[PDB]
Structures are given as C-alpha cells and as structure tokens.
Amino acid sequence: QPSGNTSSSALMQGQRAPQKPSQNLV
Amino acid sequence: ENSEKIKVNKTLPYLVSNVIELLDVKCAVIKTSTRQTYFLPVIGLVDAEKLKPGDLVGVNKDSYLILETLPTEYDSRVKAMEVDERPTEQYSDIGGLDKQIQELVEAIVLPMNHKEKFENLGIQPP
Amino acid sequence: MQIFVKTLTGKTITLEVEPSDTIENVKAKIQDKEGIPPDQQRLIFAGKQLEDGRTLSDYNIQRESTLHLVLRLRGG
Amino acid sequence: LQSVGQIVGEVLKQLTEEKFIVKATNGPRYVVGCRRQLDKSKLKPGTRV
Amino acid sequence: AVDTAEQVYISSLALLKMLKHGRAGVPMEVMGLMLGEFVDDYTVRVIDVFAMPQSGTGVSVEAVDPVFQAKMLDMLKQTGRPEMVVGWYHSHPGFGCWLSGVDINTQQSFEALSERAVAVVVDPIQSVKGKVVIDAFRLINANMMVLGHEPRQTTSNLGHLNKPSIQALIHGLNRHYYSITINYRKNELEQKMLLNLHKKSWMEGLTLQDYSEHCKHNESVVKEMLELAKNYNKAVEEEDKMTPEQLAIKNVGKQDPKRHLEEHVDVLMTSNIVQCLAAMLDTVVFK
Amino acid sequence: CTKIINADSEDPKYIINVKQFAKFVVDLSDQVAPTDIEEGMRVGVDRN
C-alpha cells in the first residue's frame, strides 16, 4: 500500500506578552 | 557588608529552568520553561563545580542569572507513589503458570535477599 | 522636650514630645503637621535607622537632638 | 552578580563584509554586524552564535 | 499666586550623568536624586546628580536604604557643593515618557514637602542616534480642575515646539499633570573643552601616503568615469524634437550629468590638489 | 487566576503554574492565613 496521503495542523499557542500595568491606587 | 549586599538580590520570584549543556569557557546554556534559550557566561550564586547537566534551577526573570539551585524534589507528576496498599493478589489466584512463577522467584526474589550467595559464588545476578 | 527634624531639602521642623512617647507617635505627629502618610516616612538618628518598638527614652535621646527624615521613594 | 545573559542563534548566509543575516531559535530573523576582533573566517553558515 | 510659563536649566554635566547611568542598567529601570537651586520665583537650576542603592527590576525600582543618602550630602558639603535636593528622576526602558500611577503617589510627598520640585523622566533606547527623549513634569490638583480655574497663566513664549505627543496625551496629560520647558544653559569655559577638543590633530596636518594607495584610487575613478561618459553620450543623442516636459514625463533615474558625472569630478579635484600642495610645502619647510 | 501543584510545608515557598505560562516560586500575601491554603486548588494571584 503506497502513500499519497495528507494531514491537518494544530495551531501555535505561544502568542502572549507582558504589558506595563497602569493601576492608579493612592 | 558584602553579605548584606547579597541578601537583597535574592528576591522570592524565580523561574524554573533546566541546564541543557555546560562549558568551561563556567558558562552554561539554559532552556527555561517559558520555552526560551539563553547562553550565559557566568553561573552566579552557586558552585560551578556543584552544578551538573539536567539539574533543575531557579532563575531571575530579567537577567537569567542563577539565584537558587532548587534541588528539592519537585519533578514529574505523582504516579505509582501511592502508599495506600501493597497489592493484594495471591499465588493461589493463579492457574497453571507455576513454572513461570518459579523461574520469576529464581530471577528476582532470591537475588533480592541472597546477593551474598552470588558474591561468594562469584556470579552476577540479572 | 523640644527636638529638631531636618530633611534633605533643607526644611527644618521643630516638634515637642516627651520621652515616654513611642516612635510611631512621632511619625503620627509628623503626619498631622506636614500631611504625609506614616508609611512613607523613614527616620535616622546619628546614623542608625530608628524603630517603632522603642521610646525616645530608649536610644538615650536628649533635647535639641537633630533627627533626619527621608522619604520612601519608589517608582514603576 | 552584574552579568546579563545573551541570545543564542545561528548564522544564515553572510551578506557583505560587515553585514550578516542571523536567526534566533524561535524569534524572527535579523540583520546584524559582528564585533571587534571577531575572527570572521570562522563565521561559516550554520555556525552557532 | 499661580504658576506661569517658566523654565528649567540643567547643566551639561548633569545631562551626561543621566544618560550614562540610564544606559548602564539597560534591562531594568533606574532612578536617582538631583540637586540645585530655586534661583528665583520662576526658574529652577539643576547642577548635579547622584545614584543610590536600588533593587531594580524590569518594570519598577525601589531604593534600598536611607543612610547612604543622608551621608553623601554631608560628604559633598565639605568639598564645596552645599546645595540641597530639588527633585528626582527615573527612566523608562522602552516605553514612552509619561508618569505611572505609582509615580503620582511618590511625587505627592515631594510636592507636600517642597512647593516646586519637578520630576524628570528619561528614555535611554529611543535616544539612539541624534536626539534625546527627556522631559519634566509636575502635578495638578484634582479639585481645581472641577472649578473653572485652569492650571496656569499665559505669556507668548508658551507655544513654541511644545506640541504634546499623542502617546503622552493618552495618559493623564493635563488631566493629571503638565509639562515644563527645558533648556541647556552651557556657560563659558566648558564650551571650549568640547568644541576645540573632541577632534584635533597636530602633525597629522602634514602626511603624504604617496605610494600606490593614491595612484590606484585615481585609476579606479577615471576608469569608471569612462563608462559614465559613454552612457551620458548615448543618453543625449536622442535629440528628439519633443519638449522637456516630456523628458520630465519619462524621467525616473540615473540622470547622468547631475546624478553621477559631477561628484566624481569634485572628488578627483579635491584629492589631487590637496596632495600636490602638501608636497610643495614640505619641499621647503624642511631644508 | 492559577493553580498550585507542590506546597512546601513548614517551608514558606510555594510553587505555581499558570498552565499557559511557566512555573514560578511564590508566597502568600499579608492578610491571608497560611492554614486554609490546601495544595491543589485554584488561587488568585497578583499581576506584579
């Protein structure tokens, strides 16, 4: 049985980055 | 004075990391669990002779200098580590395979207790 | 007992206290006179940082003593 | 205590006598120069940097 | 009383100090004090800056222990710089220049302790090539804004240049604080220790390097100018009875005469004239 | 909000995982008792 098959794909999760907080508490 | 200076920099937040490789020219390559890779030319506050590959380590977020070795076992996940019970099967529950249990007892149970019989006979058990 | 508190800006501020007074009471006096929260004040005498658990009868202070004040400066 | 840490990557092709194209492990690629006294002869494509 | 369009004079030395220190700890924020004099009712002069022990991190800073600060004034005072502090400064590694909500809580103590103390902010990695991103601010109290009263007073030198940035305008600009104009009063004497100094020479004015390094340069430039000229000849033989508007129409690039023909001439003239003159001087100054 | 995996006992250092971020060593805040913090449950965490 020869192969000419194909497949799907899962995503790349790593996308987040930190951001400067801007809380205003006296 | 120097000890006081070093006390402050050891703040609590650390990042778990694994040293993939080590080189003398004292320098180390770390992958950190954020999935980042960094070279560093100096190890910092741990004995470079004490470090070895595959050691877990806690690292500073911004500078990747080592702060603690974290040798405390916090590896993998809990499995098989239940002390709830020794298993409960008895040989009386088994049919037919008497020769297999005999060979198994020979292959494990006696070595586990009679290593000296092998040593003074001059043989190495499996 | 009259005392003098200096500061890094040259501001000088006299104050009257009694040696039974505890340090946090002094920081409260500073707060009410100046208008500054007690957390933010830090106090120095003769090169030692003072501490709340102690009276001015401790640290053997006398009148006309020159204390220094420094701010809890932070950023982020 | 004052060290900094550094990025690990690989040299792609060389581009000009002072310009190289390099790529991070999982970041984007970059165009960069090479430091003083760095013996550029060693900077074969594929070397670790 | 109320404030107006005033000013801040910072010495050259303090600027170098701030830039240097800010760039040193680059992955983390840094902060320090600054010393000067309230010379009159509306200018402020800052002379010197010094750092202090600090527990830096990639987004914030705190100062470690006070005794250091109390001491260093008393040291400096006995070698001729008695000025008290006038304000403080810190740095933003990669972001815009503006105040965080914690900087307000810091600042209020200085303002409560001294009436005019400015706050200064520096960006060390946007100041990359030929400009500096440095700025100075002060607070506006909340209740006054609700009342009809506006922050300041007006005379005509308010409006030059001082267009606020949109990035800063997103945060509490005006609403919470206002910018102050800054300028660098570089007095005399320190002027010359820079202008007449960072670049100079003496005997370098009389050096020849007359070997092949010269002849080879000539025989590169003339060689390529041969082809430049042939190109220009072809590029003008068209002589079509059209109109130079149509020439501009199709004009896109490589306008031979101006684009290339002339700079080669200027370079060749410069080099050869200077060389021959220097040789003619040395032939007489030495025996 | 995150979870905790291995609570050090009598040793105030805790370990946490964001399940999307990495694992950090962290501690408690000022007002919370250190008793009712049984290991293996969801907790709220400061951003800084």
Three-state secondary structure of chain D: CCCCCEECEEEEEEEECCEEEEEECCCCEEEECCCCCCCHHHCCCCCEC
User: Is residue B33 within 8 angstroms of chain F, CB to CB?
Assistant: yes
Q: Cβ of D23: how many Cβ atoms within 10 Å? A: 14
Q: Given B13, B33, B70, which is nearest F26 (Cβ)?
A: B13
- The encoded tokens of residue E179 equal 């910018």
Q: D: neighbours with 3+ CB pairs under 8 Å?
A: B
Domain extents in chain E: 7-195, 206-280
Sheet (strand D29-32) strand order: D9-16, D19-24, D29-32
Q: Which residues of E173-189 are buried (b: 16+ CB within 10 A; e: fewer)?
A: beebbbbbeeeeeeeee
Segment 6-45 of chain F within 8 Å of chain A by CB = 20
Resolution of the solved structure (Å): 3.8
- The encoded tokens of residue E29 equal 């924020």
Kind plus residue range of the DSSP H or E element containing B8: helix B2-9
User: Is residue F29 within 8 angstroms of chain B, CB to CB?
Assistant: no
Closest residue in A to F47 (Cα) is: A21
Q: C: neighbours with 3+ CB pairs under 8 Å?
A: E
Nearby residues of E174 by Cβ (< 8 Å), 6 or more positions away: E140, E151
Residue E92 annotated as binding site: yes
E1 touches E79 (CB < 8 A): no
Chains B and D touch (3+ CB pairs under 8 A): yes
Instruction: Give C23-47 as a 3 state SS string.
Output: HHHHHHHHHHHHCCCHHHEEEEECC
Q: Given B35, B37, B40, which is nearest D3 (Cβ)?
A: B40
> Which position has the token pair 């102050």?
E180
Question: What is the identity of the amino acid at E136?
Answer: A
Say if the Cβ atoms of D25 and B37 lie within 8 Å: yes
Query: What was the structure determination method?
Result: cryo-EM
Helices (H), chain E: 12-24, 67-77, 101-113, 142-146, 166-170, 192-195, 212-234, 244-250, 256, 262-285
| Spatial separation of the C-alpha atoms in residues E219 and C1, rounded to whole Å | 94
CB contacts < 8 A (A, F):
4
Overall size of chain F counted in residues: 48
B61 touches B44 (CB < 8 A): no
Alpha carbon F5 to its chain's center: 8
Strands D29-32 and D19-24 turn out to be antiparallel
Say if the Cβ atoms of B9 and E55 lie within 8 Å: yes
Closest residue in B to E62 (Cα) is: B8
Segment 8-27 of chain F within 8 Å of chain B by CB = 8, 13, 15, 21-27
Say if the Cβ atoms of E85 and C9 lie within 8 Å: yes
E47 touches E56 (CB < 8 A): no
CA terminus-to-terminus distance, chain D: 23
User: Is residue A1 within 8 angstroms of chain E, CB to CB?
Assistant: no
E28 touches E93 (CB < 8 A): yes
Contacts of F28 in chain B (CB under 8 A): none
Category of C10 on φ-ψ map: left (φ > 0), alpha (ψ -120 to 50) or beta: left
| Spatial separation of the C-alpha atoms in residues D44 and D37, rounded to whole Å | 16
> Which position has the token pair 């800006």?
C9
B63 touches B42 (CB < 8 A): no
Say if the Cβ atoms of B44 and D3 lie within 8 Å: yes
Contacts of D8 in chain B (CB under 8 A): 29, 37-39
Say if the Cβ atoms of E55 and B63 lie within 8 Å: no
| CA of A16 vs chain E CAs: smallest distance (Å) | 17
Q: F: neighbours with 3+ CB pairs under 8 Å?
A: A, B
| CA of D1 vs chain B CAs: smallest distance (Å) | 6
Q: Given B35, B38, B45, which is nearest D6 (Cβ)?
A: B38
Residue E103 annotated as binding site: yes
Closest residue in E to C38 (Cα) is: E109
The candidate with the shortest Cα–Cα distance to C44, out of B10, E256, E70, is: E70
Phi then psi for residue F23, to 5 deg, are -105, 135
Residue E90 annotated as binding site: yes
Q: Given E55, E58, E64, which is nearest B61 (Cβ)?
A: E58
Say if the Cβ atoms of D6 and B35 lie within 8 Å: no
> Which position has the token pair 């060749």?
E268
Say if the Cβ atoms of E66 and C73 lie within 8 Å: no
| Spatial separation of the C-alpha atoms in residues B98 and B92, rounded to whole Å | 10
User: Is residue E106 within 8 angstroms of chain A, CB to CB?
Assistant: no
Say if the Cβ atoms of F21 and B34 lie within 8 Å: yes
DSSP state of B107: I
Say if the Cβ atoms of A21 and F20 lie within 8 Å: no
- The encoded tokens of residue E281 equal 């001087």
- The encoded tokens of residue B92 equal 């009386």
Q: Which residues of B10-49 are buried (b: 16+ CB within 10 A; e: fewer)?
A: eeeebbbbebeebeeeeebbbbbbeebebbbeebbeeeee
E74 touches E105 (CB < 8 A): no
| Spatial separation of the C-alpha atoms in residues E126 and E216, rounded to whole Å | 42
Phi then psi for residue C67, to 5 deg, are -90, 165
Closest residue in E to C71 (Cα) is: E109
C75 touches C46 (CB < 8 A): no
